[model samples]
Target: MIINNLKLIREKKKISQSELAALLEVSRQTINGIEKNKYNPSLQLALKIAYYLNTPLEDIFQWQPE
Candidate 1:
């Protein structure tokens, strides 16, 4: 599953996929894929995203028992 609030938080941060991708040294498609739940970021990338969004990791990434 994809992380929660990724799209909402990104938009609220006033950052575009390309902008965030540049900050993360990744491709815009990567950001798009992540937001669309087509990809899962590495832990390092996830932490970077959380840091940039100024949000708690758990708050942004929802975890449910499967």
Candidate 2:
């Protein structure tokens, strides 16, 4: 399974969904999808998110044995 670490990092940084969405130039729903795993962002989007969050890509995502 794959998990998105946006919730974790966002909460840690105290960034609201709207705040992140603004940074990504996307809608709040887009951030919600990423948080709920409803949709996976493209590599470019993912990297952009990681950069904005100032977190490593590996720390933002993981691939499990499942």
Candidate 3:
């Protein structure tokens, strides 16, 4: 499975979903879906997330097989 720190870091950084979404060039619903586990981001968007968050991709996303 895939997991992420999207909400955690965003909130920690005091960034609202709408703000981050705009900055990431995505809709707020897009950001909401990804965080709520309703959808996954494309590889390029994932890279965008890493870049905008200023966090390593490893910290934002990870794999855990069960």
Kindly indicate the candidate among 1 and 3 with the higher TM-score. Answer: 3
Model 2 CA deviation exceeding 4 Å by range:
none
- Each candidate's lDDT (Cα)? 0.84, 0.90, 0.88
**Root-mean-square deviation (CA) per prediction:** 1.5, 1.1, 1.1
lDDT of 2 by residue, 1-66 (tens): 886788989999999999999999999999988999888999999999999999998789887886
TM-scores for all predictions: 0.87, 0.91, 0.90
Estimate, for each residue in 1-66, the C-alpha lDDT of model 3 and write its tens digit. Answer: 878778998899998999889989889999998888788898899999989989988788887889
Best by lDDT: 2
Point out where model 1 deviates above 4 Å.
Answer: 1-3
- Residue-wise C-alpha lDDT for candidate 1, range 1-66, written one tens digit per residue: 434678888998799888889988999999888888886889999999888788988777787876
Q: Rank the candidates by TM-score, best first.
A: 2, 3, 1
